[PDB]
């Protein structure tokens, strides 16, 4: 069989452009504040977020202004002021910010989630770090900040089939067949994901 010697060489030389001479985080996530475009990419944004880019503040344009970048701090999403009036927030354990940026920003961090006042341990990655919907919780108002306190029937044809099977199986069993929803939890849409589930572009 005839080996493919050159296309393997450009498999890896491309891949050592994939790690080595990447544009760092403030070279491509930079934005235009007038036309609301972006250098190096060019595209624009949906109607629900044109002002939020221009008016409000990042996740780490702010946290680059604190001692040890706020090593134990609290932070909420901006719609988590608007979708849950119950406290719903993120904490912090480690910062990976960027050094290439004059006005240092666009970095990475992670820490403790707690959704709507439901706490989770073994801290996972914080989402949407590049966005401008992230809110700096001050040191005042912490202990009152944390202010927090089965089955459905079967569809109609599956009723008739199981029951009439039961008199074939022998016993009538008019006993109402009821599937369990308690096994399946009720996750909403602004509940954040893993950030390394996404790869960087």
């Amino acid at each position: 069989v005839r080996p493919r010697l050159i296309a393997e060489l450009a498999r890896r030389v491309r891949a050592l452009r994939e790690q080595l001479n990447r544009p760092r985080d403030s070279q491509l996530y930079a934005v235009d504040y007038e036309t609301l475009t972006r250098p190096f990419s060019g595209r624009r944004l949906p109607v629900r977020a044109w002002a939020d880019v221009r008016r409000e503040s990042r996740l780490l344009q702010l946290l680059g202004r604190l001692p040890l970048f706020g090593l134990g701090r609290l932070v909420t999403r901006k719609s988590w002021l608007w979708q849950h009036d119950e406290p719903c927030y993120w904490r912090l354990t480690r910062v990976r910010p960027d050094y290439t940026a004059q006005n240092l920003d666009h970095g990475k961090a992670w820490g403790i989630l707690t959704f709507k006042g439901k706490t989770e341990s073994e801290a996972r990655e914080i989402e949407h770090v590049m966005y401008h919907d992230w809110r700096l919780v001050p040191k005042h108002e912490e202990e009152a900040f944390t202010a927090f306190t089965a089955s459905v029937p079967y569809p109609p044809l599956l009723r008739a089939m199981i029951i009439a099977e039961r008199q074939k199986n022998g016993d009538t069993s008019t006993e109402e067949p009821m599937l369990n929803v308690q096994r399946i939890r009720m996750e909403p849409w602004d509940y954040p994901a893993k950030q390394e589930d996404k790869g960087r572009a």
Partner: protein
């Protein structure tokens, strides 16, 4: 074929003439065309108002139990097929639109009263 990002979306696929369309359910693949290959054979659908006005759909449900239970995906117009049937519950696109035109009929019963 090695299709990257492959998942069964369960689809009717067109296979009829022009001006009498006729879609056919097969367990379709995502990136292939409408009349591309698929996973398995299913039982078709009639969009034609025929003699005495019926528009047929077939369902072997010993396998439509099985094939979403094989981890398949689905899109919008076929949620209209099984919610309407009684094997699945009904989708929020007739729940709006049976009442949306009822909001258009309510806009029409005033329309037939603001003229008379």
């Amino acid at each position: 074929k090695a299709y990257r990002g492959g998942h069964l979306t369960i689809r009717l696929a067109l296979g009829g003439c022009t001006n009498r369309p006729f879609y056919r359910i097969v367990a379709a693949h995502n990136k292939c065309p409408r009349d591309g290959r698929f996973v398995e054979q299913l039982g078709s659908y009639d969009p034609l108002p025929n003699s005495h006005g019926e528009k047929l759909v077939a369902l072997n449900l010993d396998r439509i139990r099985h094939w979403i239970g094989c981890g398949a995906h689905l899109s919008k117009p076929m949620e209209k097929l099984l919610g309407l049937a009684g094997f699945f519950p009904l989708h929020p696109m007739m729940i709006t639109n049976a009442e949306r035109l009822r909001r258009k009929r309510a806009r029409e019963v005033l329309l037939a009263s603001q003229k008379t």
